[PDB]
Symmetry: D4
Subunit: 132 residues, 8 copies
């Protein structure tokens, strides 16, 4: 029904678009919410941090839309994809039927190095992993 699409740098990637196009093909009614892990924690030096994160999320949304994908909403979340997912699910329980986790390729992906692809299963939702 509604998918939580977790992506930032891979928002412009053909592979992500292709998977979402596959999900549209099996379900024309499918809705995609882009969750952009971009918010760093508070620091000593720098609202401004959130504003910058919001800008990254909007830029991500536009990149995914330009690929022919309808995007219901883009949200900036914690810079940890695992923390971002946990916190989005807490904020909106029952909104999402699946997670689409979009990563850079092994060898380049920070999230893969952090084992996000397997740890994302602990939440209890189906996880579709896309390599971009």
């Amino acid at each position: 029904a509604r998918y939580l699409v977790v992506a930032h740098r891979t928002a412009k990637s053909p592979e992500l678009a292709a998977k979402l196009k596959e999900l549209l093909a099996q379900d024309p009614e499918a809705r995609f919410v882009l969750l952009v892990p971009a918010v760093p924690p508070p620091g000593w030096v720098y609202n401004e941090v959130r504003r910058r994160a919001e800008e990254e999320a909007a830029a991500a949304k536009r990149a995914l839309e330009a690929q022919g994908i309808p995007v219901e909403e883009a949200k900036a979340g914690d810079i940890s994809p695992l923390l971002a997912i946990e916190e989005e699910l807490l904020a909106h329980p029952g909104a999402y039927q699946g997670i689409v986790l979009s990563t850079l390729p092994p060898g380049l992906s920070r999230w893969l190095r952090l084992d996000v692809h397997t740890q994302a299963e602990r939440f209890g939702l189906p996880v579709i992993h896309v390599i971009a």
Copy 2:
């Protein structure tokens, strides 16, 4: 053949009913036993505790029946779903061919926070997980 349906608060949920209706569609002979994790351990202040748990189980059974699901029996078990399953399987070995674990959505579910969905596999029975 016979499914151990583990649910309490989600007994009235359309998603649970739908899955059980799917299981009926593939097997018209399917039988469902509702195991309701509701029994807290002995305390300092409060038979009465069991009686209250039995009341919750019956209420759960009625909620699931009102959804068009035939329910063979409802049992109240340990308030830990994992302990309840272990103890029901011990009490009736070979009665059940599968577990249907019904949880609240991620973000709201206590059982998901406790990793019941993956830990339930250790018993050796197939686990169908339904989010409600």
Copy 3:
């Protein structure tokens, strides 16, 4: 300040013995069941009465108890939620379980999983 997680074992000499060896103590009593069809305000009330009774039992052994709190009936969820409520308030957890062969909490591997929060865990076997 120690987070003492106990319910049935609050009266046990082993836990008293351990706390005497050890400071302030807060008693967290996993006793609040999730909402049901027949009975939230009611079950919470009963849980807080349970917490009060456990606190009396511990104090009767000679232990001063700063506060007792009823938490989620899952010790692990109770601890998580107490740490969230009062961050930085505890320097350690004292987990009091029944002995193996009787402990539900041991069967739920509360003793090992309690370490994930980041605090030192002292495990006492009582009764």
Copy 4:
């Protein structure tokens, strides 16, 4: 020589207290976010300013800091990458986290996963 992993807790008395109990210290500040669409040179610059600010905070507590480095915003990736950059330079890691209930790093089990590198890990809870 100790690899001190801290950012927000660089000013915390608990970390100072721990380093006083303990030698040379290098401060590794997980603060560099991955490249984005709007802002790499820019975010790195901001991260290095963040690292400098954390170093001042620690030195202000009475701790001499050999060098401060901004690393990947994931403490685990930061540590891995620092060990790769300067192999053999550190005899231990000092991990300073916020308390459970506030710590993102604890939620990410940085405290347990940090042991995989092969070095002794001392965990300090601050604030």
Copy 5:
């Protein structure tokens, strides 16, 4: 091709027979070697121990044959099913394309309590788990 069928008490069970009959249906050429975990380690009191184990293995073979299953050979192995598998694979590398692990029901099974069903995967062969 050739299956290592791990069973002792469940040798006479309809469910085991049924699965092996399913495997015959998809592959008429399928061959079954019954590995019977029955050999205890050396003790203080009691060749005789092995002889007793061999007797149990033969009894198991006859029980499975009486169910209409062709059995190429029965072997008695270490009383630990995990050690028995490891040692049979060491003794005959490449003989087996799969393991069929037959257990008693959860609540009754020693092997399930010992997590044999998931630990058996570490060897690198496909594992079919049958509950009897």
Copy 6:
């Protein structure tokens, strides 16, 4: 009171040496195989004779043994079932294994999995 888990190593000097360093001892002898087609009363009987023989071997080394019990041939199941039978009776487990390279119990990771019950585990390598 210690739960001493041993069978073949009951005569070993290493186990004696360890128990001398350490109290009451109960010897749990994993020796009871599950029911079979040819031989339950019979195999139990043989297992209890095995337990008695192991007890004599240990006592012959200078160790007083309160009781010896034959348990399930899986050390882990034996321990679980003994703790269930007599909850609170043991303050610790003494696990005596053959050395690595000969021990079936080590291969079955009994030494690490024994910790799940909640009791302190002392591991002795014998022979």
Copy 7:
């Protein structure tokens, strides 16, 4: 699309060839890069070590080609298959859509004893395991 085929001693095996022939049948365009774990670390006694490893890789390539398999390239990597994969993925991110891990049979395989078949999943690529 492009598969990282991890094999050394099993390069001449019919089972490996058969799987790659299956992959060709579903995708005539499939490309195979043979990664040969053969490079030991620096020692006290013995460029020469690399040269010997390169010789093993070429020999492996020829063995796989003689089986009717097109091989795009053979590379010698770290003697640890896990380290070899990690390092190849780092050197060429996005080159590979899958890993084909070819092992000797359980009972004989060093890589299986080292749990390479399950540990290989941590990289984030699909793993096809072939026993030879």
Copy 8:
């Protein structure tokens, strides 16, 4: 008697320092690669020469070495196979690795997985 697992770090002062703090030592040198297409007798020979060279390096630091053995190039397989060959001969393992950031063995989590055999493991970081 200690099983000292080292190859490149056999000359390292850190390992010497550790062995001086500690008895008999056997040096197990993971250096034997599996059979190949071009080169078994040959690669074994080269591995045993490697083992001899590592033994000289260690002895040159002031450590008496009872025997040096070339084992499987996987430290974990080498250890398993040595324990099988000579059961009961070792009371402990001394694992000498390069530092994190250079160690292949650390990347392979040899330091944590070595504990599964049942013996005490002392981990030395060298170079």
